[PDB]
Amino acid sequence: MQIFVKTLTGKTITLEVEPSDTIENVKAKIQDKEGIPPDQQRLIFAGKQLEDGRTLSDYNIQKESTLHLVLRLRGG
Template identity: 45%
Template structure:
């Protein structure tokens, strides 16, 4: 948004800035509303670490799918553990995942 004597939200991507009557000396403030990405580590059952870029608001389900694609393990066979808790549903933030956290991946035992 920009301020002169009033605040105006510049939220229409189809409009040129000139259509908002911005002039030389106008002050424009930028508010970033997308959550910043953080790096987390995934340690697999062999002890190998992989780095993932995530947002705390990412769902466990979406992260599980990304792990499946990258690690080659079917999503229904992997368990994700953070701070001793299995991550089953919700968002990564619900499990206190933050910058440089390590998430452990283990495989579910198949019955026989």
């Protein structure tokens, strides 16, 4: 499943993922890819902050679903 993330700074990041993967996995796949830790990263889909425990499937995440990446600040 191709997914996109939009970073604060204007940088477009894409990752082929599975729908059964945890969101917490894809925060650590950014640490692999782009160097950013899980801890200070909060991810956004359809207005909602996406939370530990649950999966991209639960949050209905699909083919070219664009997500948003807040560094440190909660809110935005």
